[PDB]
Symmetry: D2
Subunit: 116 residues, 4 copies
């Protein structure tokens, strides 16, 4: 998997399960074209989002539906969602892990970029 998304819940100290994750790729005209989508499993990651071949050079956006996640736990959170926007694979293929750590009024995101 060259693109992995890992979501953690800082209130419960657990992976965040059943979080919607959307990936878009910026198109020729600058609109966000849907690229992939998934829901996090028990490990806090969605199932294989893409392959090395399909994951071409470009600008990507990962959106994580944090608001729905909290609401479903009976918590009213601050953010509508969390997004990460980055350029990928512009000096050859890399593997990307986007980690998001969630609290109701805060979140952190970090990228771990390795060689394949």
């Amino acid at each position: 998997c060259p693109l992995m998304v890992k979501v953690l819940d800082a209130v419960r100290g657990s992976p965040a399960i059943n979080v919607a994750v959307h990936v878009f790729r910026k198109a020729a005209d600058d609109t966000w074209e849907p690229f992939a989508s998934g829901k996090t499993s028990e490990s806090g990651e969605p199932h294989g989002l893409t392959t090395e071949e399909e994951f071409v050079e470009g600008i990507y956006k990962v959106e994580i539906d944090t608001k729905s996640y909290w609401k479903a736990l009976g918590i009213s959170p601050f953010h509508e969602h969390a997004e990460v926007v980055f350029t990928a694979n512009d000096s050859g293929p890399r593997r990307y892990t986007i980690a998001a750590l969630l609290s109701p009024y805060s979140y952190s995101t970090t990228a771990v970029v390795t060689n394949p």
Copy 2:
């Protein structure tokens, strides 16, 4: 100031100076209408973005131009920018501080919401 944005640099342990901050408000048709803009001063905050009166109930987006900030320090960062999207002032006026802590491959954002 009912809307304050505070940007910190985790590499230098300093406020992030000269960072562009944009605020948008979601319009009737769901497009992001420009609402305010500023550049952080030496304290890492832009100059008074709005007033209590203009800061009406609605969905707001704060974008922080993190990529340009790092590039100008000769660092090549991961994110294109950082954004915070939230609903504001829907149960009366509140004061909002959006804090962003920046590193080249990571950032955290938190909201402090108080009464006026």
Copy 3:
């Protein structure tokens, strides 16, 4: 104030009120000598911890009683406390802000170091 401590609650989006903060200074024999102590007010900061004069060059430890803070809100947290250990004022006086952002199973701390 050359040493400020700012504690935020990421679950409530508020300053963390009534948090115990302890400061120690490493002594000649390497034991931690009590240096200052306070409880955060409504702004999430303890009252003036020290003066520029008393805040001499040395190794300092700031402990924040996060466990008691959460327990008192009826939450059972992961950490026993949070600590920050750093050398201060070894190239002349600096002003130090230690910011701590708290969730029940996570916390972040950052230092902002400025000239007086």
Copy 4:
């Protein structure tokens, strides 16, 4: 492995390699008895720290030698080290992942606690 430590570098967007990790367990008299130690590999984790059997109920301290890590990269960091202190396994065995995200003037730590 019931106790895992994962260290990430937010400046480089990589696992933090060759970081010293120490684990202590609080003893009958309240002194910190050495429990385990390791250095992070290329994945940012030390090699198997303990077993389910040896990892008994008690208060543990994990120290991460962040200062040496940064210094060795020619960076002068703020913190002397990072520590996490917590009670473990007091309602039966759990698996603990302590994640630390490092920048020169900041760090975050989070715990992921699962059932075996």
